[PDB]
Assembly symmetry: C5
Homo-oligomer: 103 residues x 5
């Protein structure tokens, strides 16, 4: 409870009438670092103080469930999930986010 809070995992996918390019991490930087350690890629947002938030971290691996398993090992649980679709000329893409919480 002293280090409670939220981490959101994001994933951009595409379907043609799973393939991963980048798993994004949003939340307080100290929490994301505790959970993911050196798998965290902070290049898009470097050198932030621990009590600041980020929406631009991402992970050095490409399996979604691999991110979820690490969150579970740190006592975070999935509490929500949403997805939004898009149509294009055929390919259709979507961004999915998975909200995790530690009590």
């Amino acid at each position: 409870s002293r280090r409670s809070g939220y981490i959101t995992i994001g994933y951009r996918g595409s379907y043609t009438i799973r393939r991963v390019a980048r798993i994004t991490v949003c939340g307080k930087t100290s929490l994301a670092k505790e959970v993911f350690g050196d798998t965290l890629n902070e290049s898009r947002d470097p050198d932030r103080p621990p009590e600041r938030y980020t929406s631009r971290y991402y992970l050095k691996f490409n399996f979604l469930e691999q991110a979820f398993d690490k969150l579970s090992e740190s006592g975070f649980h999935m509490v929500a999930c949403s997805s939004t679709g898009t149509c294009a000329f055929k390919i259709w893409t979507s961004y999915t986010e998975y909200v995790f919480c530690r009590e």
Copy 2:
């Protein structure tokens, strides 16, 4: 974590978090967010759907709800191509 009710967190995206809206009992929202809350509407009603937050990190809003004993119980989003609107429902028992 004293008096029960719902607070809904919303934002419209294209992540770029333009503005985080707060809906619910006005007294509950002020308990949770204090001066991070700009009301921006002129007397106040018991319920609002037009409060919004000064900061732009969604998880920072979620974390403050957690500190007051609110839990996320649902979320939904809708989009049409030309953006999207996402909503997160919190509840304190």
Copy 3:
């Protein structure tokens, strides 16, 4: 519990603008929860054990409906939304009292 059951709350939006909050479920549960804030005009004088999909509420704050459900011991167990210069949407929030 003997008075257990589901109530679904819905509303049509456009892009928050809430025109009307709909209420679906067994009528006696809806009446227990919302009392005089319930508008039964589109399905009046129903027996307490029959189901309706046509009640709505006389207020337009969604969280006020959620708060009343909580006061009667109902909890939100699911949520879904369907989308389409203005696009409309329907969102429903499923509540359950066990």
Copy 4:
């Protein structure tokens, strides 16, 4: 009582909800336990108890009546999702139930 999942499907059309068919998917013995004679097996008849179906439906049209019967048999809603089909406007929503 044996564990399992039952999914409830609802073809909707769009303030009120469009009265339509409520479909039931899962192991047939579970669906029959839950719904009894409100279950319509005419599109998948004479199935053995341990086989699965995705073609049962209910003889009433109120979704919450189906949710209530699931609750009476100890099933709980664990997920839901809908698909928007723009063309009025029709959507399909499914509600996943689980008895552990």
Copy 5:
């Protein structure tokens, strides 16, 4: 628990429901423990248990049969999302 983790079940969709292929994503040891011989590892074969995959799929067609097997191994459904224009729906399962 020692063998805790996530398995995500997917189906590409378009009496109504028609499901062709049920995809399985997660750690390969977990997918194998849950699904055994019903699992199709041909698309991603010769994989060590501690590695992850997004290319397994199931030999049967009933989504609830996949859900029931997950339950039998102590996995629970924690989230669900769908997107479409045809549709793709995924069900996230977790064993603590």
